[PDB]
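Try it yourself: sequence plus calcium ion, in.
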Amino acid sequence: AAQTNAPWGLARISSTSPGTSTYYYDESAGQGSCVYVIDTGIEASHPEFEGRAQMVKTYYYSSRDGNGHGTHCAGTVGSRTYGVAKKTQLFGVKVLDDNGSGQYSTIIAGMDFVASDKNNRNCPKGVVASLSLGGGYSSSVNSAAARLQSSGVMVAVAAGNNNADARNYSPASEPSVCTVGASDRYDRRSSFSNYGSVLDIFGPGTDILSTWIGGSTRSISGTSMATPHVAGLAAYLMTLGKTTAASACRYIADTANKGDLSNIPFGTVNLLAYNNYQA
Ligand SMILES: [Ca+2]
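Structure, out:
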């Protein structure tokens, strides 16, 4: 399948070269997979989700996304226009309040929730969790992310936006999950992206168009935006049978575009997520 005049990041993930504008993907499009977006919520009524999104848990007085961040991330995973995996099922877990903040204890509870809740959902092709959040190092937060991965969920986490080594942030620093840095449309490391040995992969993260609350769209930047590209890619590849939740991060790294990014510090991987789709 071909989607013309796609957002640059979608086009990038299906190309060996920067500077193209068509997204190419197998029409299976993540059907039969599920992606949990653990964030500020999802505006499930947005036309772009087509009835494929639902809120399953909140820790606050409402499950609505009063911020926009979670809706944007969900859109990059699985919206019809802006998403990588256009037929996946999206499940929202609201661990962050409408200011984008949350206690680590609530975030941990939300991860353990997903590890159980997947047993209540029909996801025959596999389960992914996208965590566009983080803070300072916490062994408890890292352990929760490790448990979620161990349970059979592909966990993708943002590296963070401090232009620093991600070893000092959680859950970015957990080795067993897939830690995602950000690039721009010219194949440069995004200026804010964290780096370091714990990064596994880069994805598009500067000036990413996606869904927003109030039935709208907007372009924003962050490792938060790169993460859902990788989560959606994992769902897509799992649907195709090419990998499994346990191995998907490794498979994505193995099949990535190698050596194409600039201003990657010595010792950080130079790997850009790529779907390897040949029309
Ligand atoms: Ca890792």
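One thing you can check immediately is this: Helices lie at 8-13, 69-78, 104-117, 139-150, 223-239, 248-254.
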